[PDB]
Structures are given as structure tokens and as C-alpha cells.
Amino acid sequence: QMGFSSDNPYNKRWEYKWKHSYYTYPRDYEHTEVRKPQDSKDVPPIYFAYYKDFVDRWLPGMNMWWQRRHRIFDKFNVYFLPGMSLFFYQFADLALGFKIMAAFPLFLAYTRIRDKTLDPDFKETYLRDMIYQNPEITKYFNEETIHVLDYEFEYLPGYLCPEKFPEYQNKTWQFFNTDTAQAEGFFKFGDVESGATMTLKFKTMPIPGKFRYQVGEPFYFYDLRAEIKCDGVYKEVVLVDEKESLKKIRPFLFLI
Amino acid sequence: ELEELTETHNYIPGAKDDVNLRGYLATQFAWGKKVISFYRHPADDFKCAKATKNMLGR
Amino acid sequence: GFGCFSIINYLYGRYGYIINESSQKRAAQDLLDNDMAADKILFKNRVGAPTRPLRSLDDMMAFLSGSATYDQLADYASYNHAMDVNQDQQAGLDSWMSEKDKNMVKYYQRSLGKKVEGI
Amino acid sequence: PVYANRDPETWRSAQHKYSKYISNFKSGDGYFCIPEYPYAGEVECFNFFVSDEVWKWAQHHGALSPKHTFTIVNANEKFVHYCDSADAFIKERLEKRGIRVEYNTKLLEVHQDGQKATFINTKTGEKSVRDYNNLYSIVPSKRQEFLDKAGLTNGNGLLN
Amino acid sequence: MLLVKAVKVLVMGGCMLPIAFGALGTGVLFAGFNVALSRNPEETESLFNNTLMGFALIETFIFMSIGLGFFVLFA
Amino acid sequence: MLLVKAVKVLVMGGCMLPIAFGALGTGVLFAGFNVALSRNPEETESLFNNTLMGFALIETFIFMSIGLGFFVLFA
Amino acid sequence: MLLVKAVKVLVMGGCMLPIAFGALGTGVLFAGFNVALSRNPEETESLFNNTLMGFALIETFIFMSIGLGFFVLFA
Amino acid sequence: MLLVKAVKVLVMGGCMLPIAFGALGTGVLFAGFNVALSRNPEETESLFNNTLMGFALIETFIFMSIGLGFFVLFA
Amino acid sequence: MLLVKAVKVLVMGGCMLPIAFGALGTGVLFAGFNVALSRNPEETESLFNNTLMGFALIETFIFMSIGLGFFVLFA
Numbered sequence: 001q002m003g004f005s006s007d008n009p010y011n012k013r014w015e016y017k018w019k020h021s022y023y024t025y026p027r028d029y030e031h032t033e034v035r036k037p038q039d040s041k042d043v044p045p046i047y048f049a050y051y052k053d054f055v056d057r058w059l060p061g062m063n064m065w066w067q068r069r070h071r072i073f074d075k076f077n078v079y080f081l082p083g084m085s086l087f088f089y090q091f092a093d094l095a096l097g098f099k100i101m102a103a104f105p106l107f108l109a110y111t112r113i114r115d116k117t118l119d120p121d122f123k124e125t126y127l128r129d130m131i132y133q134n135p136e137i138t139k140y141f142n143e144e145t146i147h148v149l150d151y152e153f154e155y156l157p158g159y160l161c162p163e164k165f166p167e168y169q170n171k172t173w174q175f176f177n178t179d180t181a182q183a184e185g186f187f188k189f190g191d192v193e194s195g196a197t198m199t200l201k202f203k204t205m206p207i208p209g210k211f212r213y214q215v216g217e218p219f220y221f222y223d224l225r226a227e228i229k230c231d232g233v234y235k236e237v238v239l240v241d242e243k244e245s246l247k248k249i250r251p252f253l254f255l256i
Numbered sequence: 257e258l259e260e261l262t263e264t265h266n267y268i269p270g271a272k273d274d275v276n277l278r279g280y281l282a283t284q285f286a287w288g289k290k291v292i293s294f295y296r297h298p299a300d301d302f303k304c305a306k307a308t309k310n311m312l313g314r
Numbered sequence: 315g316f317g318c319f320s321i322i323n324y325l326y327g328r329y330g331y332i333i334n335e336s337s338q339k340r341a342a343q344d345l346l347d348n349d350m351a352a353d354k355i356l357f358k359n360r361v362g363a364p365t366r367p368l369r370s371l372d373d374m375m376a377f378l379s380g381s382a383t384y385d386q387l388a389d390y391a392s393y394n395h396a397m398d399v400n401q402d403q404q405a406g407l408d409s410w411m412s413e414k415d416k417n418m419v420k421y422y423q424r425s426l427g428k429k430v431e432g433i
Numbered sequence: 434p435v436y437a438n439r440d441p442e443t444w445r446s447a448q449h450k451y452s453k454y455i456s457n458f459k460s461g462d463g464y465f466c467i468p469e470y471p472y473a474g475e476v477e478c479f480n481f482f483v484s485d486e487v488w489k490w491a492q493h494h495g496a497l498s499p500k501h502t503f504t505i506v507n508a509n510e511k512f513v514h515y516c517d518s519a520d521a522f523i524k525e526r527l528e529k530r531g532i533r534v535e536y537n538t539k540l541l542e543v544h545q546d547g548q549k550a551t552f553i554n555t556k557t558g559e560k561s562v563r564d565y566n567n568l569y570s571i572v573p574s575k576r577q578e579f580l581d582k583a584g585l586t587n588g589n590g591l592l593n
Numbered sequence: 594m595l596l597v598k599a600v601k602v603l604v605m606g607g608c609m610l611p612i613a614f615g616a617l618g619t620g621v622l623f624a625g626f627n628v629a630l631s632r633n634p635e636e637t638e639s640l641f642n643n644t645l646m647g648f649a650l651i652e653t654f655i656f657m658s659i660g661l662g663f664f665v666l667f668a
Numbered sequence: 669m670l671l672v673k674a675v676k677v678l679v680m681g682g683c684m685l686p687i688a689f690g691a692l693g694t695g696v697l698f699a700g701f702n703v704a705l706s707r708n709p710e711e712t713e714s715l716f717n718n719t720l721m722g723f724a725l726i727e728t729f730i731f732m733s734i735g736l737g738f739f740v741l742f743a
Numbered sequence: 744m745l746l747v748k749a750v751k752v753l754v755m756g757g758c759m760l761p762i763a764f765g766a767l768g769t770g771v772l773f774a775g776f777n778v779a780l781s782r783n784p785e786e787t788e789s790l791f792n793n794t795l796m797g798f799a800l801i802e803t804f805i806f807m808s809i810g811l812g813f814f815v816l817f818a
Numbered sequence: 819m820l821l822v823k824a825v826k827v828l829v830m831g832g833c834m835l836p837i838a839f840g841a842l843g844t845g846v847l848f849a850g851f852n853v854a855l856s857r858n859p860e861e862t863e864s865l866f867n868n869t870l871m872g873f874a875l876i877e878t879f880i881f882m883s884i885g886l887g888f889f890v891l892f893a
Numbered sequence: 894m895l896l897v898k899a900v901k902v903l904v905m906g907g908c909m910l911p912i913a914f915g916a917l918g919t920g921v922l923f924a925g926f927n928v929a930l931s932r933n934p935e936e937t938e939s940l941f942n943n944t945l946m947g948f949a950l951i952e953t954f955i956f957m958s959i960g961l962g963f964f965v966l967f968a
């Protein structure tokens with residue numbers, strides 16, 4: 001699901017990505033059809049630029065934090081950092097060093113809230129390169145003729161089944177995280193040439209790569225399935241199977 | 257067209273002209289002879305920055 | 315770092331005497347014990363100035379280990395008139411000094427704002 | 434993830450794979466293989482006590498998956514042949530730490546494609562293939578024939 | 594006491610000696626860069642990079658001493 | 669008192685030491701530039717920019733010294 | 744007593760002398776590496792490594808001096 | 819007073835140190851100009867210009883010290 | 894007594910003079926190695942061994958000085 005969304009009807013999955021060069025916001029939202037001069041309001045009201053920045057930049061940004069608030073309710077953000085901020089706030093008048101140690105855990109909480117509330121962005125260029133390498137998909141789909149009908153990608157809530165992923169049953173990791181950092185979604189594709197359609201379901205999880213402490217890929221497709229549908233032919237392609245991918249690599253269990 | 261350059265704050269002379277001949281006549285004897293790049297806006301800044309294992313991004 | 319350095323520097327101001335107050339009391343009396351010993355072994359001319367600190371090895375150490383030795387000698391050398399007199403003594407003009415002339419430096423120290431007794 | 438006791442001659446100063454055996458063990462089955470005596474590096478190459486302590490920290494904060502297996506595949510029946518007191522302490526400390534051992538088994542083959550390691554129990558002659566993700570083995574030795582053609586070595590291949 | 598304080602402030606002045614050698618070490622390094630550049634101007638990148646990297650280590654010692662200076666001046 | 673002040677002013681004189689090494693490091697830098705220039709004059713511009721650039725970093729330390737000079741002299 | 748203490752802090756300042764020479768010796772070494780690179784840039788990694796290695800040996804003397812400093816400063 | 823002035827004038831004498839290094843750097847600068855000229859005399863005027871340019875940056879440090887000298891001598 | 898002890902401590906600091914010269918000598922030797930290495934890298938092993946050997950001879954004098962220092966410091 002897309003968290004950052006305004007009343008603009010076009011380009012929903014690109015609204016947070018596109019950086020417009022506008023000085024202020026357009027008078028009216030992008031029109032879906034040709035309208036009449038009286039359909040819009042000339043000389044918009046006073047303080048209109050400040051109103052737009054609130055309902056087009058601030059409000060959709062707060063709806064994101066509210067939509068994904070279930071990912072920040074961990075014991076570290078809720079109890080540790082605020083309690084650490086209060087212990088030094090009682091001594092803020094003694095010296096400047098206490099003001100800093102009382103505000104740092106709050107700026108740290110915002111950073112974790114900021115990063116955790118963003119929409120999960122995978123490397124889509126790695127994905128399209130992966131499917132365009134499969135002959136069963138390129139048989140019906142090509143980049144010059146493919147179009148997106150629907151897109152959904154959101155984190156999975158809470159801890160998962162503690163038999164397929166026993167890693168998340170760690171009280172030290174749970175103290176910092178209340179979610180899993182995994183995401184699940186699909187891709188509705190269509191080809192204007194062959195008329196084919198397919199639902200590209202996929203699951204992702206962060207993995208370690210080639211290093212000790214740093215994550216290798218926060219969104220690694222360990223399950224990638226495509227249910228291709230054509231004029232009268234139905235195919236099911238398995239680019240990445242989870243039963244064979246989970247035997248080689250395990251999640252990363254982000255901390256902080 | 258002059259109002260379009262003003263209202264968009266494209267007040268760098270000759271930015272939107274493919275051949276800014278007026279820009280070459282003024283720079284015939286200038287140091288670091290150069291003309292403004294095509295469609296250069298006085299507000300855009302494409303500056304980047306990176307941190308490497310060495311200092312100063314090297 | 316700024317938070318910790320500003321904190322420990324505060325604790326060292328509020329607290330700290332718990333472990334260093336002894337070293338200050340020791341140096342306080344020591345700074346007075348060595349000064350009293352300097353006045354015992356030091357050449358003072360008709361004014362209270364240690365003009366011969368290098369007379370012997372024991373005088374060099376007593377002059378350096380003292381606190382007021384630097385001032386009694388610096389104030390004597392910083393007094394224009396006192397050095398004009400000495401410049402005349404070197405030429406052969408000298409005489410006896412009264413109790414008021416002997417304290418020409420104490421008057422000079424008082425003028426600068428010093429706390430000097432024995433006028 | 435296949436590691437050994439020495440560095441090959443094809444590596445330059447910019448290669449540090451030797452240092453990743455302990456660090457890059459995020460998950461999977463680990464094997465520490467000991468060849469058949471006589472071999473070089475009896476005690477100066479046993480790093481399964483430092484790895485356990487380092488791999489003990491990973492399991493505390495989740496860096497190392499909880500479903501991992503590390504076992505010592507010893508071809509020989511004992512670690513230190515000519516010192517029982519030393520070998521007794523090792524076998525005693527391995528148990529206190531919680532490490533598993535398999536004697537009379539020596540590594541035989543390594544498949545770099547699917548990460549398959551073929552082991553064989555010299556005592557029973559029964560071989561098996563096991564998936565690995567972090568493998569360490571002390572390079573095995575080999576007796577030279579020119580010392581046997583002259584009639585100098587005795588048995589194992591050492592000088593008499 | 595008062596003299597030891599005088600030596601402390603004096604040592605702080607001695608810290609300006611690396612500052613002098615750092616200047617000479619800089620001109621020497623850039624003097625070689627010029628020559629090294631004329632000999633083979635194709636590899637400007639590497640030469641130029643290694644130059645500043647050296648300049649870094651040179652000035653590193655400079656500020657290291659400055660720290661040592663204030664340290665002795667107050668400790 | 670009078671001794672320490674005499675040392676403070678003394679250290680202020682020490683700051684003129686880098687000023688000396690900066691002069692030598694400067695002549696050496698331009699000495700090499702002339703050689704580097706005569707070696708390959710086609711790339712004069714590159715040598716020249718790098719020449720003056722190094723000089724900037726050289727007198728930068730010199731200015732930095734004067735800072736410490738007045739600091740101890742008044743702090 | 745205090746006289747010896749004055750020399751203790753004075754010797755501590757003297758430790759900034761290798762710091763100055765270490766800075767100059769750094770520029771000289773890297774100045775040569777620049778020229779050596781233009782000459783035969785095929786062995787960058789080799790020459791580059793030898794440069795940092797030699798430098799490490801320099802800081803060894805530097806830290807050695809500082810260690811010697813605090814030693815005589817307190818013993 | 820006079821004693822502080824005595825160390826001020828003493829510092830004022832230190833200003834002659836860059837005046838000394840400036841002479842050596844000058845000789846080195848023109849030394850390179852000569853050898854560099856021999857290798858490529860086709861660009862004499864170019865070298866000559868950069869030669870005198872460097873000698874100016876030398877006196878820049880020199881006059882700077884004399885300024886610093888007279889200042890602290892009276893301030 | 895207290896004076897000769899101060900000179901003993903003073904001489905102990907003087908040992909850091911070879912330390913400075915040794916640091917500068919290190920860059921020079923390694924500089925000659927790098928440049929000499931680029932000119933003939935086929936025999937890097939030979940030049941490299943000779944380099945460290947010389948560096949060892951340098952530390953000989955270094956340790957000799959410190960040895961001399963501690964000696965006169967207590968003898």
C-alpha cells in the first residue's frame with residue numbers, strides 16, 4: 001500500500017518519488033478531463049500556498065506515520081529513549097551536556113520512525129531484469145509493450161511463524177523491533193501486443209551480503225511467482241522458490 | 257517570450273537560445289571563454305557529495 | 315562527546331575536592347614553607363629585591379621554588395626610578411637610604427594595586 | 434565459504450578471505466575437518482575455540498541463525514597423539530562448550546557448485562554427502578616417494 | 594610554580610615548529626606533483642588524489658601537536 | 669606575572685618561524701613549476717592551477733599560526 | 744624540585760620535534776611516490792602499499808616519542 | 819616595562835628569520851628557472867613571468883612578518 | 894643535586910632528536926625505494942629487502958640513543 005497519497009488522481013506509486021520543481025503547488029489538482037473556466041476558481045483564496053503545502057505535503061506525510069505506526073511500538077522507542085530523555089532533562093539547567101543527552105534519544109527516535117514509516121522501496125530495476133531473462137515471460141511480455149494495472153507492496157505485521165523463521169524469536173531483537181521487516185505484494189501486468197496478463201506475486205526479506213555488520217539487500221526476493229494468463233493459455237512460472245532459497249540464506253534481523 | 261523568461265526566473269541571458277550568438281560576442285576576449293549551458297536555470301543545483309574510505313571524497 | 319565532556323567537567327567543578335583537596339592544602343602550605351625558607355637564604359639589598367639569585371646553587375633553587383621572589387624582583391626591575399638609581403650606583407654615586415627610600419618598591423607595588431604591608 | 438589453513442599463492446595483498454571464516458558464518462552447517470595424521474598444524478591451527486566464543490555473540494543478537502550446526506570432523510581418533518593431557522583437556526572443553534565431534538571421518542570431496550561435501554568414515558568405509566555453508570580444513574600432507582625409494586622413511590612416511 | 598606555568602606557555606609556542614615544516618612539506622609535495630604531472634599528464638587523477646592524501650597525513654601531525662600543546666598548557 | 673607576559677610575547681615571535689619556511693616552500697614550489705613547465709608546456713593550465721592551489725594551503729598554516737600566536741598572547 | 748619539573752614539561756614539548764620532521768618526511772615520501780607513479784603507473788598497488796607501510800614506521804617513532812614524553816613527565 | 823619591551827624588541831629581531839629563508843628560496847627559484855629555461859628556451863618569457871610571480875609571494879610572507887613585528891613591538 | 898638531575902632529565906629529552914631525524918630519514922629511504930622500484934620493478938624483492946635492512950640500521954642508532962639516555966639518567 002502507498003502511504004504518501006494526496007487527492008491527486010494520477011501516478012499514485014510515483015507521488016513520493018517525483019520531485020517537482022514547482023515554486024508552489026498548482027492551483028488545481030491534475031485534471032482527469034477538460035473542464036470549464038467556471039469549474040475552477042480564479043485568483044485562489046488568500047494563504048492558499050500555505051494551505052496546499054499542508055494538505056499536499058504535511059498531511060500525506062502524517063498519514064504515512066499513522067498508517068505504519070505498528071512498526072515503531074517497540075520497547076526501545078517507547079520506554080528506553082523517552083526514559084533516557086527524562087533522566088537528563090531534570091539536569092538540563094546544570095549544564096549544556098545534559099540538554100544534548102536529553103535531545104539525542106529523541107532525534108534518534110525520529111530517525112527510526114522516519115526510516116521505518118517510509119514505503120518499502122525495492123530495487124525494481126533488478127526485478128525487471130530478472131523477469132526479462134526468463135523465456136517463458138518474454139514470450140508474452142516486453143518492456144516496450146508492458147503496462148502496470150495494479151501494484152501493492154507492504155510490510156508484514158508482527159512476528160511470523162516460529163518454525164519457518166525461528167530467527168525472530170530473539171528477545172534481544174524483539175526489544176528493538178515489533179515487526180519483521182518483511183514485505184509481501186504482487187504486480188498486475190499486461191502486454192498490449194500479446195494481450196497477456198499475469199500476477200507477479202513476490203515475498204521479500206532483508207539478507208546479509210559479503211560483509212559482517214551491514215545488510216546486503218534489504219529486499220531480497222526469496223519467493224517470486226508468476227501466474228501468466230493469455231488468450232486461452234494459463235501458465236505458472238516460478239522464478240524463485242522459497243523452499244530452496246531459505247536453505248541458503250536467512251534474514252538479517254535489523255537492530256536500531 | 258520575454259515575459260516567459262521573467263515569470264520562470266530564467267534571467268540568465270541566452271539560456272533558452274540554442275545559439276546564443278550575443279553570448280559569444282561578449283566573450284570574444286573573456287577569461288575562461290564559455291557560454292551558459294542550454295536551458296540553465298539560475299536556481300537549479302545538481303551538486304553531489306560522497307564519503308569514501310579516503311578523505312575529501314577521494 | 316560534548317555531552318560527556320560538559321558533564322564530567324561539571325562534576326569536577328561541583329565535586330572533585332573529594333580526591334584533590336588534599337593536594338591543594340599540601341601545595342598551599344608548601345608554597346608558604348618554601349617562601350619562608352627563601353627569605354632565610356637570599357641576598358636582599360637595601361630594598362627587598364633578590365638581586366643575587368645565582369650567588370650559589372642553593373639560592374638558584376630557593377629563588378625558583380618561591381612565589382613572591384619573581385614579583386619582588388620583577389617590580390624592582392619594572393620601576394623606572396629604581397633602575398635609574400642603580401644605573402647611577404654603577405657609575406659611583408651612592409649613599410645611605412632612609413626608611414622611606416628603602417620602601418620605594420612597596421610604594422610602587424601599592425600604586426599598581428598590590429597588597430603590600432610594612433610602609 | 435570454503436576455507437583452509439594456508440593462503441594460496443594466487444592471492445595478492447588486497448585479498449583477505451582468510452579473515453571471513455569466523456565473521457561470515459551468518460547461518461548454515463559448519464564443518465571443521467582434520468586430516469589423517471601425520472599432518473602439519475596440530476595445535477597451532479585449532480581455531481574452533483575462538484570461533485565458538487565469537488559465534489556465541491552472534492546468537493545473542495541474531496547475527497547467527499539459531500538453526501546452525503558446527504561439528505569437528507576428525508579423521509584421527511585423537512587430536513593430540515603424543516600428549517594425552519592436552520588431548521584430554523580439549524575433548525573435555527569441547528563438551529563443556531557444547532561442540533559435537535565425529536571421529537574416523539575425513540573429508541573426501543568438495544562440490545563448489547551446490548556446496549556439497551562428501552565425507553567418509555574410514556572405520557566403517559561408509560561415505561555421505563552433507564550440505565555446508567562454512568567449511569574449514571587443515572591441508573592434508575603427503576609422503577614423498579624419493580624418500581621411500583632410498584629406504585629412509587618408516588611406515589607413515591616420516592624419517593627413521 | 595610560576596616558572597612551570599611560563600614553560601607551559603612556552604611549549605605552546607614550540608608547537609608552531611611542525612606548522613613550519615608542514616608548509617615546507619606541502620610545497621615540496623606540490624612541487625613534485627607538478628613535475629610528476631608534466632612527466633605523465635595522462636594519470637592526473639591518481640597523482641592528484643595521492644597528493645591530497647599525503648597532505649592529509651602532513652597536516653594530521655600538525656593538529657595532533659596543537660592538541661598536545663593545549664594539553665600541556667592545561668595539564 | 670611579568671615573566672609569563674614576557675613569554676607570551678616571546679611565543680608571538682615564534683610564529684614568524686613558519687613564515688620563513690613558507691617562503692622557502694614557496695620558492696621551491698615555483699622552482700619545480702618552472703621545471704615541470706619547461707618539461708611539458710602543453711599542459712600549463714593544469715600545472716598552474718595546482719601550483720597556486722598548493723600555495724594556498726601553505727599560507728593557510730601560516731595564517732593558522734598567527735591565530736595561535738594572538739591566542740596565547742591574549743588567552 | 745620544581746626546576747626538574749620545569750624540565751619535565753619542557754621535554755614534553757620537545758616531543759613535537761619529530762612531529763614536525765614526520766610531517767616533512769611524509770611529503771617527501773609522497774612527493775617521490777607521485778613521480779614514481781608517473782614513471783611506471785602499472786604498479787600502483789605495489790608502490791601505494793610501500794608508501795603507507797613506510798609512513799606507518801614513521802608514526803611508530805612519533806608515538807614512541809610521545810610515550811617517552813609521558814614517561815619522563817611522570818617518571 | 820622595559821623588560822617586556824626587551825622581549826618585544828627581541829621578538830622584533832626574529833622577523834629577520836623569514837628574511838633569511840626568503841633569500842634561499844629566491845636562489846632556489848631562479849636556479850630552477852635557469853635549468854628549466856635551458857631545456858625549453860622557446861618559452862623564456864613564460865618562465866620569466868612565473869619566476870618573478872613567485873618572488874612576490876615570498877615577500878608577501880616577508881612584509882607580513884615585518885607587520886607582525888612592528889605591531890607586537892608597539893601593541 | 895637538583896640541578897644535575899634537571900640536566901639529566903634535559904638530556905633525556907635530547908634523545909628525541911635522532912627520533913625526528915630518523916622519521917625524516919625513513920621517508921627518504923622509502924622514497925628512493927619507490928622511485929627505484931618503478932625504474933626496475935622486476936627485482937622488487939631485492940630492493941625491498943635492502944630497504945627494511947637500512948630501516949633496521951636506523952633504529953639501531955635510535956635504540957642506542959635511548960639506551961644512552963637512560964644510562965646518563967641514572968649513571
Ligand SMILES: CCCCCCCCCCCCCCCCCC(=O)OC[C@H](COP(=O)([O-])OCC[N+](C)(C)C)OC(=O)CCCCCCCCCCCCCCCCC
Pocket residue numbers: 015016017018019020057058061062065
Ligand atoms: C508540547 C508543545 C509542542 C511543541 C511544538 C511542537 C510543534 C510540532 C508541530 C510543528 C512542527 C511540524 C514539523 C515541521 C517540519 C516537517 C515539515 C513537513 O511537514 O514535512 C512533511 C514531510 C513531507 O515529506 P517531504 O517534505 O520530504 O517531501 C515529500 C516528497 N515530495 C517533495 C516529492 C512531495 O513528511 C514528514 O516529514 C513526516 C510527517 C512529519 C511529522 C511532523 C510532526 C507533525 C505533528 C502533528 C501533531 C498532531 C497532534 C497534535 C496536533 C493536533 C492538531 C489538532
Ligand SMILES: CCCCCCCCCCCCCCCCCC(=O)OC[C@H](COP(=O)([O-])OCC[N+](C)(C)C)OC(=O)CCCCCCCCCCCCCCCCC
Pocket residue numbers: 072073077078103106107109110114
Ligand atoms: C523546550 C524546547 C524543546 C525543543 C525540543 C527540541 C526541538 C529542536 C529545537 C527547536 C528547533 C525547532 C525549529 C527547527 C525545525 C527543524 C529544522 C530541521 O532541520 O528539521 C528537519 C528534519 C528533517 O530530517 P530528515 O532526516 O527527515 O531529512 C533531512 C536529512 N538531512 C539531515 C540529510 C538533510 O525534520 C525534523 O524535524 C527532525 C527533528 C524533529 C525533532 C523532533 C523531536 C522529537 C522526536 C520524535 C519523538 C518520538 C518519541 C518516540 C515515542 C515512541 C514512538 C511511538
Ligand SMILES: CCCCCCCCCCCCCCCCCC(=O)OC[C@H](COP(=O)([O-])OCC[N+](C)(C)C)OC(=O)CCCCCCCCCCCCCCCCC
Pocket residue numbers: 286287288289713717
Ligand atoms: C561593477 C559593479 C558590480 C560588480 C559585481 C561583480 C562583477 C564580477 C564580474 C564577473 C567576475 C567573474 C570572475 C570569474 C573568473 C573565472 C575565470 C576563469 O574561468 O578561469 C579560467 C582560467 C584561465 O583560463 P581562460 O582561458 O579563461 O583565460 C586565460 C587567461 N589568459 C589569457 C591570461 C591566459 O583557468 C582556470 O580555470 C582557473 C580557475 C581559477 C578560478 C579562480 C576564481 C574563483 C573565483 C570565483 C568564485 C567566486 C564565488 C563568489 C560567491 C560569493 C557568494 C557569497
Ligand SMILES: Nc1ncnc2c1ncn2[C@@H]1O[C@H](COP(=O)(O)OP(=O)(O)OP(=O)(O)O)[C@@H](O)[C@H]1O
Pocket residue numbers: 017121122123124125126
Ligand atoms: N549509482 C548511483 N550513483 C549516484 N547516486 C545514486 C546512485 N544510485 C542511487 N543514487 C541515488 O540514491 C536514490 C535511491 O536509489 P534507489 O535505487 O532506491 O531508487 P529507485 O527508484 O527505488 O530504483 P528502482 O526503481 O530500481 O527500485 C536515488 O534516487 C539516487 O539519487
Ligand SMILES: [Mg+2]
Pocket residue numbers: 121122123124
Ligand atoms: Mg525502488
